[PDB]
Design a protein around this nucleic acid. Structure first.
Ligand SMILES: [Zn+2]
Length: 339
RNA sequence: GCCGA
DNA sequence: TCGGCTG
């Protein structure tokens, strides 16, 4: 197929639809739109199920509301027949020549641009008093005290974010959050994650990037020699020596350093199918994956194993150091672990 | 539609 | 009340 013409004609034929948004991340071309087949919902205008994915070799229009998965050409056949002809002409026109997309291959990225020198309205946890509610809450979270120099507490999290990235929220309503600054390899903060307090925060638990090319891996600056253990939680990574944590829904293996010695230590969730998909895609890369198949504790994450089943960190490090598998042995491990 | 806040 | 989610 011809993906760039799919993206171009999808942008042409979906821009005039209501609630259109050109969601383009650095490898993914997606279009969000109200689906004209079903209309989505009057309440769910912003929650528009009309989705186009052009990052694949074929461009697919999948709407989850009316269950309408279709290529862009079928959409043009049903709705834009002038654009469909033009499409049929242009595809057989461009079949003869070679792809020219590679010719203007440039990058508009940048290095460290919004380097976070200070955190206004934030007090670090080690300089906070021992009877502070955030201090009592992290006492309930059982984080060791010596790492309390890595976490801040705020009450003005929208004001703090708008001090760094203005215009994120129209209202700076005061909100207590746990600031986890995510530093690069050289030790300076490139982002910060606003961890929800109490049972949950009101709204918008989001990692705030200083710039779109900033790191999403917390604790890279604290990596010493030995095997590097990757985790899903920054607080979960705080119980781990040489423990880093990816902060984001996208899991790029290339942006994670230590390719020789990274260890994937994910959640203990066998019933969860996306979890099985994550390890799967990790073992398909031939990577070193840590397996929860012989865990004496049955909680979800390492902090949970500590809080809810009374686990100590030394048992945790010996369990990860005794259960790194790779290759077909790991594949059989995931196999027997999955169900 | 499912999940997260 | 929002975004992101395969077929
Ligand atoms: Zn629809």
């Amino acid at each position: 197929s011809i993906p760039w013409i799919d993206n171009e004609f999808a942008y042409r034929a979906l821009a005039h639809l209501p609630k259109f948004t050109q969601v383009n991340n650095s490898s993914t071309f997606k279009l969000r739109f109200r689906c004209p087949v079903c209309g989505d919902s009057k309440t769910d205008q912003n929650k528009a199920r009309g989705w186009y994915y052009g990052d694949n070799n074929e461009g697919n229009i999948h709407c989850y509301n009316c269950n309408y998965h279709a290529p862009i050409g079928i959409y043009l056949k049903e709705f834009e027949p002038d654009l469909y002809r033009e499409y049929i002409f242009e595809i057989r026109k461009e079949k003869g020549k070679s792809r020219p997309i590679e010719k203007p291959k440039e990058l508009p990225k940048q290095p460290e641009k919004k380097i976070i020198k200070s955190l206004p309205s934030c007090v670090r946890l080690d300089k906070l008093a021992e009877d502070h509610p955030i201090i009592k809450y992290v006492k309930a979270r059982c984080i060791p005290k010596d790492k309390w120099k890595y976490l801040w507490f705020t009450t003005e999290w929208p004001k703090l974010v708008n001090s760094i990235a203005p215009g994120t929220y129209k209202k700076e309503i005061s909100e207590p959050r746990l600031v986890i600054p995510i530093y690069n390899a050289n030790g300076k903060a490139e982002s910060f994650q606003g961890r929800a307090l109490k049972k949950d925060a009101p709204q918008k638990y989001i990692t705030i990037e200083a710039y779109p090319e900033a790191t999403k891996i917390y604790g890279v600056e604290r990596v010493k020699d030995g095997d590097v253990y990757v985790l899903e939680g920054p607080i979960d990574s705080l119980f781990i020596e040489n423990g880093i944590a990816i902060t984001g829904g996208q899991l790029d293996l290339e942006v994670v350093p230590f390719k020789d010695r990274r260890v994937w230590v994910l959640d203990n969730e066998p019933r969860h199918p996306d979890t099985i998909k994550r390890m799967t895609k990790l073992v398909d890369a031939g990577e070193r994956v840590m397996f929860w198949d012989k865990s004496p504790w049955k909680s979800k994450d390492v902090n949970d194993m500590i809080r809810k089943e009374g686990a100590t960190p030394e048992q945790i490090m010996e369990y990860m150091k005794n259960n790194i598998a790779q290759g077909l042995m790991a594949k059989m491990r995931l196999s027997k672990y999955a169900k």
